[PDB]
Design an enzyme around this catalytic site. Structure first.
Site, PDB file in Angstrom:
ATOM      1  N   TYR A  61      -7.118  -7.526  -8.987  1.00  0.00           N
ATOM      2  CA  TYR A  61      -8.051  -6.424  -8.716  1.00  0.00           C
ATOM      3  C   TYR A  61      -8.112  -6.152  -7.203  1.00  0.00           C
ATOM      4  O   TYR A  61      -8.470  -7.030  -6.456  1.00  0.00           O
ATOM      5  CB  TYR A  61      -9.474  -6.701  -9.285  1.00  0.00           C
ATOM      6  CG  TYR A  61      -9.811  -5.826 -10.468  1.00  0.00           C
ATOM      7  CD1 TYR A  61     -10.116  -4.502 -10.282  1.00  0.00           C
ATOM      8  CD2 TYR A  61      -9.789  -6.313 -11.776  1.00  0.00           C
ATOM      9  CE1 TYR A  61     -10.389  -3.674 -11.340  1.00  0.00           C
ATOM     10  CE2 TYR A  61     -10.064  -5.489 -12.859  1.00  0.00           C
ATOM     11  CZ  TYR A  61     -10.361  -4.166 -12.636  1.00  0.00           C
ATOM     12  OH  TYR A  61     -10.631  -3.289 -13.663  1.00  0.00           O
TER      13      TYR A  61
ATOM     14  N   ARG B 125       6.378   5.185 -13.428  1.00  0.00           N
ATOM     15  CA  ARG B 125       5.462   6.231 -13.750  1.00  0.00           C
ATOM     16  C   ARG B 125       4.242   6.100 -12.827  1.00  0.00           C
ATOM     17  O   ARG B 125       3.437   5.196 -12.980  1.00  0.00           O
ATOM     18  CB  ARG B 125       5.083   6.207 -15.231  1.00  0.00           C
ATOM     19  CG  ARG B 125       6.263   6.282 -16.178  1.00  0.00           C
ATOM     20  CD  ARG B 125       5.840   6.480 -17.643  1.00  0.00           C
ATOM     21  NE  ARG B 125       5.655   7.880 -18.008  1.00  0.00           N
ATOM     22  CZ  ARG B 125       6.622   8.738 -18.302  1.00  0.00           C
ATOM     23  NH1 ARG B 125       7.891   8.388 -18.288  1.00  0.00           N
ATOM     24  NH2 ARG B 125       6.300   9.993 -18.592  1.00  0.00           N
TER      25      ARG B 125
ATOM     26  N   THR C 101       5.104  13.237  -8.681  1.00  0.00           N
ATOM     27  CA  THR C 101       5.316  12.055  -9.498  1.00  0.00           C
ATOM     28  C   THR C 101       6.459  11.268  -8.908  1.00  0.00           C
ATOM     29  O   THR C 101       7.227  11.805  -8.117  1.00  0.00           O
ATOM     30  CB  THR C 101       5.603  12.415 -10.969  1.00  0.00           C
ATOM     31  OG1 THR C 101       6.709  13.307 -11.048  1.00  0.00           O
ATOM     32  CG2 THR C 101       4.403  13.090 -11.578  1.00  0.00           C
TER      33      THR C 101
ATOM     34  N   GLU D  55      -9.651  -3.013  -5.671  1.00  0.00           N
ATOM     35  CA  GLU D  55     -10.396  -1.777  -5.469  1.00  0.00           C
ATOM     36  C   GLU D  55     -10.634  -1.500  -4.001  1.00  0.00           C
ATOM     37  O   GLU D  55     -10.990  -2.391  -3.243  1.00  0.00           O
ATOM     38  CB  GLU D  55     -11.733  -1.826  -6.198  1.00  0.00           C
ATOM     39  CG  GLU D  55     -11.584  -1.745  -7.699  1.00  0.00           C
ATOM     40  CD  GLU D  55     -12.898  -1.776  -8.425  1.00  0.00           C
ATOM     41  OE1 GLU D  55     -13.635  -2.755  -8.238  1.00  0.00           O
ATOM     42  OE2 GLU D  55     -13.173  -0.823  -9.180  1.00  0.00           O
TER      43      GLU D  55
ATOM     44  N   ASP E  54       3.285  21.113  -5.623  1.00  0.00           N
ATOM     45  CA  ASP E  54       3.599  20.019  -6.584  1.00  0.00           C
ATOM     46  C   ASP E  54       5.094  20.009  -6.777  1.00  0.00           C
ATOM     47  O   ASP E  54       5.621  20.805  -7.563  1.00  0.00           O
ATOM     48  CB  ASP E  54       2.887  20.205  -7.930  1.00  0.00           C
ATOM     49  CG  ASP E  54       3.190  19.085  -8.958  1.00  0.00           C
ATOM     50  OD1 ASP E  54       4.159  18.303  -8.815  1.00  0.00           O
ATOM     51  OD2 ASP E  54       2.437  19.023  -9.946  1.00  0.00           O
TER      52      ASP E  54
ATOM     53  N   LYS F 198      10.415  11.123 -12.237  1.00  0.00           N
ATOM     54  CA  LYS F 198      11.371  12.131 -12.628  1.00  0.00           C
ATOM     55  C   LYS F 198      12.611  11.965 -11.770  1.00  0.00           C
ATOM     56  O   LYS F 198      13.200  10.878 -11.780  1.00  0.00           O
ATOM     57  CB  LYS F 198      10.755  13.503 -12.534  1.00  0.00           C
ATOM     58  CG  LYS F 198       9.506  13.678 -13.353  1.00  0.00           C
ATOM     59  CD  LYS F 198       8.981  15.077 -13.133  1.00  0.00           C
ATOM     60  CE  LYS F 198       7.747  15.323 -13.971  1.00  0.00           C
ATOM     61  NZ  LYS F 198       6.495  14.784 -13.413  1.00  0.00           N
TER      62      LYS F 198
END
Ligand SMILES: Cc1[nH]nc2c1[C@]1(C(C#N)=C(N)O2)c2cc(-c3ccncc3)cc(F)c2CC1(C)C
Ligand SMILES: Cc1[nH]nc2c1[C@]1(C(C#N)=C(N)O2)c2cc(-c3ccncc3)cc(F)c2CC1(C)C
Ligand SMILES: Cc1ncc(COP(=O)(O)O)c(CNCC(=O)O)c1O
Ligand SMILES: Cc1ncc(COP(=O)(O)O)c(CNCC(=O)O)c1O
Ligand SMILES: [Cl-]
Lengths: 442, 442
Positions: free
Chosen positions: A54, A243, A234, A56, A208, A237
């Protein structure tokens, strides 16, 4: 007090499906414009024990301790993303925590404009994303239409961004962000002309570049970094990573965007970041900067040119009559078959492609085209010469689809009945399977 | 046309940091209540080429083909999820696409209420999540406070959910959802009285059981499925899976909710699903329905009761004066050291725990406790007998913290100056490292 048995023995049911899935990828002509194949290194990162942690917050400003090796990884991923896209860390920042494309866009939009905020983007039908404001009269399909106030600009009857339409709408609608960069748009973009419209009406410029990222990093295509306030991409691709997503913001043009965007990702929208993702992106961002990868991206464009050229040579119509990138959309209207039919037919022969709308289509049901792309097959070693075959295979399928539509009729329910037990498809599937099956496979 | 060199070859720089991270996890008493350690099987899934596939939509209703082995995996995971949580697939549906807990909750909240929709949850200070409507005077810190209208309910001066306050606040606010289940709440929940309150005002009941998920599956704690319209949970904490989330919805109670929740995950919020997550969640849910995992979950509780007892035997105060679950909050007021300082100290000795507010604290700057949890160490094979050691190490640290605060003072900048080189911390770290270093490590 745990089970350390290998996946094969602990869950044999699942391992079999995965080995099947593995085989279907190995044995498929994959023309999904947004897919790729990740190397072992990117996948070793994805399965690393770093996801146990974790973290954060951000580097050097974590809520919890024990994040020193995590911080090195997040810092090494951010630097490599600024390096890969040719930006000084003095002028541009990058957030590496968005878990995927759709999150990063909703996040970045919220940062700039907030709830009830005003945005523009390309309609879904013309080539924009759901996350670029997509709605219909029936319902606000995307959160980007409902948590913002969205309006949508179309391409002309030929499939090109019509800038005179963007300006007509921007001045009447007076938005705070205009989104360009697209999901199925076969040409390059005029970011400069978009800046003129955005400067006119005091709107942010949002690019984008998820479909074309590699082209932007490799300086083959136009660079939105010289004009945009925000760039999202992203990583899965054409970039060929895991991902995930990246949010880029221009500090010089907009003071205090760094805070706005980092707080929008966390704690506004996300909790803990997924560190295995961050690690994996770092791993691919190294490769994205190497000269080997420039060659591959060049090769993706050379295959897409060759493919459009060969499809034209068999009298197949392409939206905008060609491509400036990795992707083509085929106008199937002259053969009087739907895009959905050809998909169904192409899946029967291990050809992955998807149905896609064209400028003459009014509704999203019954789209009149298909989108194809070269990054996946380019990744599997195909060259300019292999595009004739892919073209031959798709022509053969268009024809097989015409034969089967005349026999079984023009309703999707009836058409499919035709697909199983058709000797030509089994014949074609086999050819596909032999050529694809033996191609290099990461 | 790819690079298949192993991770250590391709990116030695990154491979070192990861091997360090691995070493630190192996040599750390991890009391982070929300962390665990995944087995090699869950890690092989997360590294599976299934993440290559774009499968926007749901099983049997996909946008693209090629999705027969993906559909099998998304169908296996949903069934295995419904079995593990003791619910009939006629009565309950599950969505397995949410990328992490915070996404699941924003998505599920939107489905129920929509934008501008009214919600109630437990305040952050009192033990609830950011995604349960958290805001401050200064800012709407969560999207759940901004896209929704949220009101927050406190625990009493002893640390307990105060139902009589939940009613007072529900009846004058009239929300559409009330949220229970929490991030740092050390006791079980009265779901029935929440249901009664929810029926009275016509609101939905939303149970987020991310921290207690395993206790619910294994029938050790109260079952929120008997009362709630929606249950959310992460898959990475006590459940011991990957970083992901599940949304559960009650069809019997609310007809037409299945569509609402499924359309909220996609296409309202997310795009493509992360299939390696989905595969990995399946692999863990097999394990969750085994009695070996009941044995482990029982063991997590036995350790937590034992740890609480041993902490009390050293005259260390606990919030609510004990625990019903996996987690304890230590009230550090009697030693007049803050949670921040104890965290700093505990990192210096390889004890990972986190700072945590307590009922007496007005604001989250300088929280007066720390949260600890047993799932990680239970996973590394610690038993009841070993908790005295953890207790004794936590005591020794509390004492060192008091000493360093006497010498260097009560300002965090000045305090940390004392940590490096301190002979007792080096002493204590060596002891932590030798005990932790030895424990079984998946
Ligand atoms: C799902 C999705 N996500 N972002 C997207 C799509 C696309 C699409 C196209 N054209 C574009 N441009 O981007 C799409 C959308 C819809 C659709 C229709 C009606 N309502 C919702 C979705 C139907 C499609 F066949 C497609 C092809 C696609 C996946 C590339
Ligand atoms: C980050 C986060 N996410 N969901 C959470 C937290 C917590 C927290 C507590 N107490 C609770 N109950 O749940 C937390 C939050 C803030 C905070 C304060 C002001 N603004 C943003 C964050 C500061 C903290 F020290 C903590 C401890 C925590 C991580 C367990
Ligand atoms: C321009 C664009 N932006 C964002 C996304 C969202 O990525 P996630 O699916 O990771 O949320 C997509 C994927 N679009 C699907 C396709 O074109 O095949 C896209 O094409
Ligand atoms: C009740 C609850 N709900 C949702 C989440 C969100 O999980 P993601 O980090 O995957 O978004 C958390 C984790 N909170 C962190 C902790 O308590 O340690 C939580 O405790
Ligand atoms: Cl992942």
């Amino acid at each position: 007090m745990f089970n350390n048995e290998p996946l094969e023995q602990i869950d044999k049911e699942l391992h079999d499906i995965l080995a099947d899935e593995e085989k279907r990828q190995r044995e498929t002509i994959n023309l999904i414009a947004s897919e790729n194949l990740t190397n072992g290194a990117v996948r070793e990162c994805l399965g690393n024990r770093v996801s146990n942690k974790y973290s954060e917050g951000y580097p050097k400003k974590r809520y919890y301790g024990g994040n020193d090796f995590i911080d090195k990884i997040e810092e090494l991923c951010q630097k490599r993303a600024l390096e890969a896209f040719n930006v000084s860390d003095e002028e541009w920042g990058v957030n590496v925590q968005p878990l995927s494309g759709s999150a990063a866009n909703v996040q970045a939009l919220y940062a700039l404009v907030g709830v009830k905020g005003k945005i523009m983007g390309m309609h879904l039908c013309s080539g924009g994303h759901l996350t670029h404001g997509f709605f219909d009269e029936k319902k606000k399909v995307s959160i980007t239409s409902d948590m913002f106030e969205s309006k949508l600009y179309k391409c002309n009857s030929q499939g090109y961004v019509d800038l005179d339409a963007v300006r007509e709408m921007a001045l009447s609608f007076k938005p705070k962000v205009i989104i360009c960069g697209y999901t199925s748009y076969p040409r390059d973009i005029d970011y400069q002309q978009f800046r003129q419209i955005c400067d006119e009406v005091n709107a942010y410029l949002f690019a984008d570049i998820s479909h074309i990222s590699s082209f932007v990093a490799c300086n083959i295509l136009n660079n939105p970094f010289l004009h945009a306030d925000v760039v999202t991409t992203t990583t899965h691709k054409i970039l060929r990573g895991p991902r995930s997503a990246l949010i880029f913001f221009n500090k010089k043009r907009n003071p205090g965007i760094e805070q706005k965007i980092n707080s929008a990702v966390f704690p506004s929208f996300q909790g803990g970041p997924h560190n295995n993702k961050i690690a994996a992106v770092a791993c691919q961002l190294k490769e994205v900067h190497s000269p080997a990868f420039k060659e591959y991206t060049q090769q993706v464009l050379l295959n897409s040119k060759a493919l459009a050229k060969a499809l034209i040579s068999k009298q197949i119509d392409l939206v905008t009559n060609g491509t400036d990138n990795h992707l083509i959309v085929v106008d199937l209207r002259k053969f009087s078959i739907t895009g959905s039919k050809l998909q169904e037919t192409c899946n029967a022969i291990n050809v992955s492609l998807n149905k896609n709308t064209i400028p003459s289509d009014v509704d999203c049901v019954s789209p009149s085209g298909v989108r194809i792309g070269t990054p996946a097959m380019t990744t599997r070693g195909a060259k300019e010469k292999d595009m004739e075959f892919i073209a031959d295979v798709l022509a053969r399928a268009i024809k097989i689809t015409v034969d089967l539509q005349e026999q079984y009729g023009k309703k999707l329910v009836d058409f499919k009945k035709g697909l199983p037990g058709n000797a030509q498809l089994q014949q074609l599937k086999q050819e596909v399977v032999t050529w694809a099956g033996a191609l290099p496979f990461p």
